[PDB]
């Protein structure tokens, strides 16, 4: 009952998600900017990621559950691109705008004006990223992942491509991530 218990604090995916970086331990969060629980997880997870070892990284993917949602995935892509060095501020700003302010960032006309006005993070650079072909292809991939892996709830966190965190609350889930990361690290080394 202590530590990792399959079916209790984690489960194993039927089909693993390929990691972006080989030989590292990926922590993958599926989320949506419209999602209140995702906005609450955000500060916990982003803080915890500061503790990550050099062989771990946090990857995020926005779900696409309807055609209108692709714009939000393109925003997520743009933040990843242009705001890599201050993603936390950007996500903070976007969750507030969507969840608290009720701004329709899923509408490109609304989103582009809003982005141009942000400076707590580099809104103009994120706007440029949004307008780039990279972001359209990052967003298409998010839809593909959503459908292929049947991600039907957010937030969802998967470690090492295969271990889904079953959260009791956000804080305890961070401990689960650490345990799963060690499990992965030593699985991947034992197989090499």
**What SS3 state is found at 10?**
strand
What does the domain layout of the chain look like in residue ranges?
1-192
Beta bridge partners of 57: 26
In this structure, whether the domain defined by 1-192 belongs to CATH 2.40.50.100 is answered with no
Q: Which helix (H) or strand (E) holds 165?
A: strand 163-165
Method: X-ray
Scored b (16 or more CB within 10 A) or e, 129-160 reads bbebeebeebbeebbebbeebebeebbbbbbb
Q: C-alpha 77: how far from its chain's center?
A: 10
């Amino acid at each position: 009952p202590a530590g990792l218990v399959e079916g209790q604090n984690y489960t194993v995916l039927a089909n693993p998600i390929p990691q972006q970086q080989a030989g590292k331990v990926e922590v993958l969060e599926f989320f949506g900017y419209f999602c209140p629980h995702c906005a609450h997880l955000e500060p916990v997870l982003s803080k915890h990621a500061k503790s990550f070892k050099d062989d771990m990284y946090l990857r995020t993917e926005h779900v696409v559950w309807q055609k209108e949602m692709l714009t939000l995935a393109r925003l997520a892509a743009a933040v990843d691109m242009a705001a890599a060095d201050s993603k936390d501020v950007a996500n903070s700003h976007i969750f507030d705008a969507m969840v608290n302010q009720k701004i329709k960032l899923q509408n490109p006309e609304v989103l582009k004006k809003w982005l141009g006005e942000q400076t707590a993070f580099d809104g103009k650079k994120v706007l440029a990223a949004y307008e780039s072909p990279e972001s359209q292809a990052r967003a298409d991939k998010m839809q593909e992942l959503t459908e292929t892996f049947q991600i039907d709830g957010v937030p969802t966190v998967i470690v090492g491509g295969k271990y889904k965190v079953e959260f009791a609350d956000w804080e305890s889930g961070m401990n689960t991530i650490d345990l799963l990361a060690d499990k992965v690290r030593e699985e991947q080394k034992a197989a090499q």
